[PDB]
């Protein structure tokens, strides 16, 4: 855990796609989330009760990490990707959002650069992914299929 | 709910594998998590606000149950088991971790005994399960498959 | 610094004051905090196979 947490950040999209579990494992487990799960009492805890302001700040940090995690999982579920780090969809690429070939982006761009190129199309793409899944379920409820 | 919560604890691994929903259902639902979800206000709540230390202790207990649940679910997701109480993997058994035949462990050992036999190989096994899933995804991204 | 001085071209430096925050800026200048955003999308040749 955290042995190369953002190690692929400067690498290409292709190479970086091979380290996806590395970042996923660090979204729900900060130091305080490890101390909170010791078999022994952590001892510190009395401090956070005697002084309730510190107790509240710690809980807010823990609750937020959980809420952010769950929201990303909910979107993957809605889009039809329950689990999987990499999933294919039926939404075609518009070639307006970005107009580059596969041999250019997977080999020459980093994920940070990509993110800064299509950031204002994010909501359009997410909207289409949701519509696609709804259409798929409508087709599933037809026993003659395709 | 809680009608035989650890009832299989003294039973064999084989028999105990048939009660897995019994323990799973009790990880997110303690008494306070039921009172918190009443249609009526619980009434007690004012106590936990007037005296903020008790309010904080209760939240810490609730947040922790959620964090522990989610961490186990994240590991199952990483290992390629989204959902399912029982899942098969591609990691071979080493016969060093434990060197017993199937007819000995499934019929004669309890899960508590098993846990005390291979506890210091837990991290090795978990590491291998993650590597296995990453290798599987690398193979999935090949349209000629196997 | 005081400001400019004369045509002799000199500068005068004095011990300064300022907010206590300048003491922390001397140690934390190397650090930045960022939020990690794990989802993203990109073009590929795969298509969900409907089964």
């Amino acid at each position, epitope marked *: 855990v955290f042995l190369g947490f953002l190690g692929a950040a400067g690498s290409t999209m*292709g190479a970086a796609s091979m380290t996806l579990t590395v970042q996923a494992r660090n979204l729900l487990s900060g130091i305080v989330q490890q101390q909170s799960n010791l078999l022994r009492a952590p001892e510190c805890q009395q401090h956070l009760l005697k002084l309730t302001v510190w107790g509240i700040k710690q809980l807010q940090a823990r609750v937020l990490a959980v809420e952010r995690y769950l929201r990303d999982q909910q979107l993957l579920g809605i889009w039809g990707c329950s689990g999987k780090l990499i999933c294919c969809t039926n939404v075609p690429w518009n070639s307006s959002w970005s107009n580059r070939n596969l041999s250019e982006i997977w080999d020459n761009m980093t994920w940070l650069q990509w993110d800064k190129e299509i950031s204002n199309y994010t909501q359009i793409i997410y909207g289409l992914l949701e519509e696609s899944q709804n259409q798929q379920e409508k087709n599933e409820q037809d026993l003659l299929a395709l | 709910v809680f009608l035989g919560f650890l009832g299989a604890a003294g039973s064999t691994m084989g028999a105990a594998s048939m009660t897995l929903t019994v323990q799973a259902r009790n990880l997110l639902s303690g008494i306070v998590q039921q009172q918190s979800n009443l249609l009526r206000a619980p009434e007690c709540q004012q106590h936990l606000l007037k005296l903020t230390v008790w309010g904080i202790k209760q939240l810490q207990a609730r947040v922790l149950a959620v964090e522990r649940y989610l961490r186990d679910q994240q590991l199952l997701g990483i290992w390629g088991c989204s959902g399912k109480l029982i899942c098969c993997t591609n990691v071979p058994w080493n016969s060093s971790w434990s060197n017993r035949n199937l007819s000995e462990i499934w019929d004669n050992m309890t899960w508590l005994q098993w846990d005390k036999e291979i506890s210091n190989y837990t991290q090795i096994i978990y590491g291998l399960l993650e590597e296995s899933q990453n290798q599987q995804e690398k193979n999935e991204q*090949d349209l*000629l498959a*196997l | 610094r005081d400001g400019g001085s004369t045509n002799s071209t000199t500068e005068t430096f004095r011990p300064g004051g300022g907010d206590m925050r300048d003491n922390w800026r001397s140690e934390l200048y190397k650090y930045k905090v960022v939020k990690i955003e794990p989802l993203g999308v990109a073009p*590929t*040749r795969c298509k969900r196979r409907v089964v």
Partner: antibody
Amino acid sequence: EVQLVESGPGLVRPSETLSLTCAVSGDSISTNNGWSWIRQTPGKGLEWIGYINGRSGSTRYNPSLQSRVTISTDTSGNQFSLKVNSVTAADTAKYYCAFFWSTYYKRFDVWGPGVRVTVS
Amino acid sequence: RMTQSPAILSLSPGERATLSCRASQSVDSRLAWYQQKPGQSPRLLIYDVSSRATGIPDRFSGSGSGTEFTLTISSLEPEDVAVYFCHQENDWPWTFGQGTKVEIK
């Protein structure tokens, strides 16, 4: 970038096994899955024979030859080969060595010149 | 599992040539086209119905889905005399159509 060079008998008799090989230059065959054989038969057109996965040794064969063809590798020689049993006149064809790359990110082929084989 | 049509086209230089290919079963979007000149092994032109292979002139294009596909060559040149093949990439048998010829006069 690789080059594929086929070689083998240009004549096989009825009920004999036909054996063709392909050398690979420029890359390894112990990896790079998708080494394959393609047959071009006058009067029928193109069809696949099958392919091999250099990393595992597994193979897949077109059902018409499920009981007739073997594909295997010589990773030391960095060459691979095709053997078809019980060859008959109907199997006269131009045989090719090919490399098919098909992934989520790239698609390409490399073809060798092939071997024309007469079957009596 | 796919049939091309017509067996042969004969076109004037600069004219646009079109070849159709029909599947017996859906092949989704997994269709490739190849160009085989006499004495040559087939060259990949188009993959996934409309994506050009690296090194292919912009004369070449195509479209289609499911079972109905077309290969188009605009501004046809004498160097395009070849047999064009329709290749199925949506199933295990990977069949090919029979191949059609385009000749420039």
